[PDB]
């Protein structure tokens, strides 16, 4: 359960990220693959080297999913239903892996938004990413 304050915090961070979102999405993916190499197994047809056009393009998709969650934060289960089906049924994504990506997403925000990554906003973001992760693992 995200609080009203959590909602405004997340919205504010999102707003400050601005048009970098897609690029930050790609960065979070890279940080994930390098830090937690087991996750790479899910992208065997992707070239995952630095500068990969595939990782770039995919990061925008990931960012786009997250902003859609932010914009419909009061009904994430509905907004992310198609994506939750994909991740559980088709991809069979291990639930642990959502924690790994969520951490990389926080790191990325932290490395880019010094003013916004306060302890409070950090808490709000972590809750937001845990809720998104809960939805995306709700369909096994």
């Amino acid at each position: 359960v995200l609080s009203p304050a959590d909602k405004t915090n997340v919205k504010a961070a999102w707003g400050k990220v601005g048009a970098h979102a897609g690029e930050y999405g790609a960065e979070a993916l890279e940080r994930m693959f390098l830090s937690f190499p087991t996750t790479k197994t899910y992208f065997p047809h992707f070239d995952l080297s630095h500068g990969s056009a595939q990782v770039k393009g995919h990061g925008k998709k990931v960012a786009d999913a997250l902003t859609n969650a932010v914009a419909h934060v009061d009904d994430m289960p509905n907004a992310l239903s198609a994506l939750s089906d994909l991740h559980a049924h088709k991809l069979r994504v291990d639930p642990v892996n959502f924690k790994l990506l969520s951490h990389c997403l926080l790191v990325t925000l932290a490395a880019h938004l010094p003013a916004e990554f306060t302890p409070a906003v950090h808490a709000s973001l972590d809750k937001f990413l845990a809720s998104v992760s809960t939805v995306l693992t709700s369909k096994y």
Partner: protein
Amino acid sequence: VHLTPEEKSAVTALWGKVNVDEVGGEALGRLLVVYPWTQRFFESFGDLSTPDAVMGNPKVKAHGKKVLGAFSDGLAHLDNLKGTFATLSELHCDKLHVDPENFRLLGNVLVCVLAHHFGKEFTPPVQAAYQKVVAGVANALAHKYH
């Protein structure tokens, strides 16, 4: 755990820039704020009702200093984190009964603090090096459960 020389390099170089009087407290505070159940073990610290109370709490800063002390020690003995953390493991496991998953969480929080403080300098390869480090520390600290 085994870091490459390039990773040992990436790690030690950044760590030399860390403010050892601040970062420990910054990480402990966030742990308490982001994962509030951890506050369970720190009730003697006093006001923890708000993030501002937590982060400005002088006990939090002082105890954080000791916590970073241990991470520094671990950085000093990467190839023997188990011996380094034996005593702390007895304390955290046999005495305190902290669930070892919170060792992983604190390590990740520290990583977020480093990212925050170092920004662009905290590159994906540098983070990867640090992830091996905090994972090694959590594993050593959890030895008494194993």
